[PDB]
Design a protein around this ligand. Structure first.
Ligand SMILES: Nc1ncnc2c1ncn2[C@@H]1O[C@H](COP(=O)(O)OP(=O)(O)OP(=O)(O)O)[C@@H](O)[C@H]1O
Ligand SMILES: Nc1ncnc2c1ncn2[C@@H]1O[C@H](COP(=O)(O)OP(=O)(O)OP(=O)(O)O)[C@@H](O)[C@H]1O
Ligand SMILES: [Cl-]
Ligand SMILES: [Zn+2]
Ligand SMILES: [Zn+2]
Lengths: 69, 69
């Protein structure tokens, strides 16, 4: 089934690349109806980044949650 | 840069999982303006599958080519 290829990929993608900043915590994310948005940083490092005034790691990557457009 | 996260993922995804059928050849694919469609099989195994009358591996997974929707 093709949706499971997509899901297992998104599963893996999420697991194998942690927060770009603290490098252990998994990333923050959310659902945009159609897509899964994986934020670069976990939530703690994100808020922290704002307190320290560093926006280098701010951003996200959206993934279509289905196999078909 | 967030588009490069997407591109390098799509790069990897394409490289590490070959034709579901012959298991060595890389998959057939094409661009759908917005998305990259990775077909399950290379083109040779695909046409062959039709000649032998087996549609088990027919299908594709679409990937948004950008980091942002
Ligand atoms: N945990 C996080 N790690 C890295 N970057 C983040 C994180 N959370 C938010 N950002 C970035 O901060 C900016 C604002 O985030 P957010 O997604 O809240 O946008 P917004 O203006 O609130 O609109 P929306 O509510 O639709 O997202 C975007 O660049 C987002 O990618
Ligand atoms: N190389 C391939 N490996 C596995 N499945 C394939 C391959 N090529 C096509 N298919 C599948 O065969 C069906 C038809 O393919 P195709 O993408 O040509 O659809 P279509 O009806 O031609 O419309 P479009 O031209 O928009 O794709 C779809 O299920 C497609 O996923
Ligand atoms: Cl995607
Ligand atoms: Zn972190
Ligand atoms: Zn093949």
């Amino acid at each position: 089934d093709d949706d499971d290829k997509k899901t297992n990929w998104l599963k893996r993608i999420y697991r194998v690349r942690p927060c770009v900043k603290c490098k252990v915590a998994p990333r923050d994310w959310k659902v945009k109806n159609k897509h899964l948005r994986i934020f670069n940083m976990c939530k703690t490092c994100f808020n922290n980044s704002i307190d320290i005034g560093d926006d280098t790691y701010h951003g996200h990557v959206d993934w279509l949650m289905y196999a078909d457009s």
